[PDB]
């Protein structure tokens, strides 16, 4: 008797990538369940007898020496942010971004994108810091979404920015195409032909997009007091760790009670 389509995607959930089985081959339900619980069990004892680190938290870390040791000072800011940051984005109560944001009071929003808090970050430290200003933050975002292969209503974004000299679209390139390679993931970077100055840049992954880069100065820098060239990139942490781990949903990289450094927790 051939497998329900139930059945399939339960033994989905266990399988992993690299587990070489046939699914088509004449073993009843219930072994072939029993056989991936043993080992999805197995994987979470290696985990826990050897490392014991989560995969988001561990890519959090590398990225932030990756970033430190280039000259990047990295940041923690808000997640709670005002909803006029949200306007003085560009995003008006008409844009299809405003119906995905999720509201918490009369006044503030769970943040959408970390560019709000740099915007505000990158005019104050120029009081400060010598040129040119390098920062970066990692943490939560927040969208309500219409889709779930490639995303997530809680995700974990990375946005690195250079503000003065050396902001150019080569320069901008080179650390995109530095940071995937040291990450060990296969990338292309599609932009358009003759763009120089307000450029914007796709990270692809196959279809995938893994960031959306910006070569400044672009017009709305003025709403935040930044009247100087920049350059800056957003990545998703969790469309890396897919990449990364060939993960086949995005959903087993996130957050989650549901999945482990991708093995299933429903054992
Ligand atoms: C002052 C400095 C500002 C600065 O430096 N600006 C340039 C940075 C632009 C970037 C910034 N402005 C931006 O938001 O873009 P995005 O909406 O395309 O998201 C970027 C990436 O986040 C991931 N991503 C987005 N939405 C999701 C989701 N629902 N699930 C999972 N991953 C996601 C995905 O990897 C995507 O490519
Ligand atoms: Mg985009």
Excluded at 15 to 39: M, Y
Excluded at 194 to 209: A, F, Q
Excluded at 241 to 250: A, E, P, S
Aim: charge should be negative.
């Amino acid at each position: 008797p051939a497998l329900t389509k139930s059945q399939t995607d339960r033994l989905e959930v266990l399988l992993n990538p690299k587990d070489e089985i046939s699914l088509n081959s004449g073993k009843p339900f219930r072994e072939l369940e029993s056989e991936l619980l043993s080992r999805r069990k197995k994987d979470l004892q290696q985990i826990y007898a050897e490392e014991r680190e989560n995969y988001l938290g561990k890519l959090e870390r590398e990225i932030t020496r990756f970033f430190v040791d280039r000259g990047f000072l990295e940041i923690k800011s808000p997640i709670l942010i005002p909803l006029e940051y949200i306007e003085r984005m560009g995003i008006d109560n008409d844009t299809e971004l405003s119906k995905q944001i999720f509201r918490v009071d009369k006044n503030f929003c769970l943040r959408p994108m970390l560019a709000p808090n740099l915007y505000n970050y990158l005019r104050k430290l120029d009081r400060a810091l010598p040129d040119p200003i390098k920062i970066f933050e990692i943490g939560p975002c927040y969208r309500k979404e219409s889709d779930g292969k490639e995303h997530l209503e809680e995700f974990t974004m990375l946005n690195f920015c250079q503000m003065g000299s050396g902001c150019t679209r080569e320069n901008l390139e080179s650390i995109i195409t530095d940071f995937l390679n040291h990450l060990g993931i296969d990338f292309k970077i599609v932009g358009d032909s003759c763009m120089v100055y307000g450029d914007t840049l796709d990270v692809m992954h196959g279809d995938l997009e893994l960031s959306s880069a910006v070569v400044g100065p672009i017009p709305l820098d003025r709403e935040w007091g930044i009247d100087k060239p920049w350059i800056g990139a957003g990545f998703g942490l969790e469309r890396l760790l897919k990449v990364k781990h060939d993960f086949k949903n995005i959903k087993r990289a996130a957050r989650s009670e549901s999945y482990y450094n991708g093995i299933s927790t429903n054992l």
